[PDB]
Amino acid sequence: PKALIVYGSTTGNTEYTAETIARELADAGYEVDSRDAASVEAGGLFEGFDLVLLGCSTWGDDSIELQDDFIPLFDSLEETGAQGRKVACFGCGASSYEYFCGAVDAIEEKLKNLGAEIVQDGLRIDGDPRAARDDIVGWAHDVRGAI
Numbered sequence: 001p002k003a004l005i006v007y008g009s010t011t012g013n014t015e016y017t018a019e020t021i022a023r024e025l026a027d028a029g030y031e032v033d034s035r036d037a038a039s040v041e042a043g044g045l046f047e048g049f050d051l052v053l054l055g056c057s058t059w060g061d062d063s064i065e066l067q068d069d070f071i072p073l074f075d076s077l078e079e080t081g082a083q084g085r086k087v088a089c090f091g092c093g094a095s096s097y098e099y100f101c102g103a104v105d106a107i108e109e110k111l112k113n114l115g116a117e118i119v120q121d122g123l124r125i126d127g128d129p130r131a132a133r134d135d136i137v138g139w140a141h142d143v144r145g146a147i
């Protein structure tokens with residue numbers, strides 16, 4: 001299958017997460033297209049992919065703020081071709097904040113309102129993702145068995 005991975009990362013944690021997931025899918029034979037949200041255009045972005053994985057860190061503290069590069073995409077999610085698309089979300093955060101990985105929840109909610117098919121519960125990483133690598137690998141495995 002063909003998968004598209006789009007991620008927004010300020011310090012590289014969600015980017016590290018996206019590349020770990022990308023490598024697991026490619027090792028299984030998928031054709032994987034991994035892009036930073038900063039270089040993407042929302043219009044028709046999901047057209048042609050069997051699976052779309054969206055990753056985003058959570059900022060803001062007292063109010064949720066999506067990772068800076070991901071904002072424009074989130075705002076135009078209506079134009080990407082999400083209706084009937086198999087999607088799954090992931091992201092880095094810290095459980096010391098009130099809205100832990102709140103960006104993952106906001107993106108899942110919008111995707112379900114747009115008619116996408118969420119294939120697996122989102123991956124929510126607490127702290128350094130390098131220390132939760134087995135969980136990232138495990139979630140990537142589960143998504144493949146879900147499409």
Ligand SMILES: Cc1cc2nc3c(=O)[nH]c(=O)nc-3n(C[C@H](O)[C@H](O)[C@H](O)COP(=O)(O)O)c2cc1C
Pocket residue numbers: 008009010011012013014015056057058059060061062063064065067092093094095097098099100101102127
């Ligand atoms: C100022 C500040 C505000 C933050 N706000 C939140 C938050 O509201 N919720 C959360 O789960 N994590 C919050 N974080 C934690 C970041 O999401 C976390 O460091 C994450 O690993 C960053 O990932 P990235 O390098 O892919 O952008 C915050 C971190 C900072 C420094």
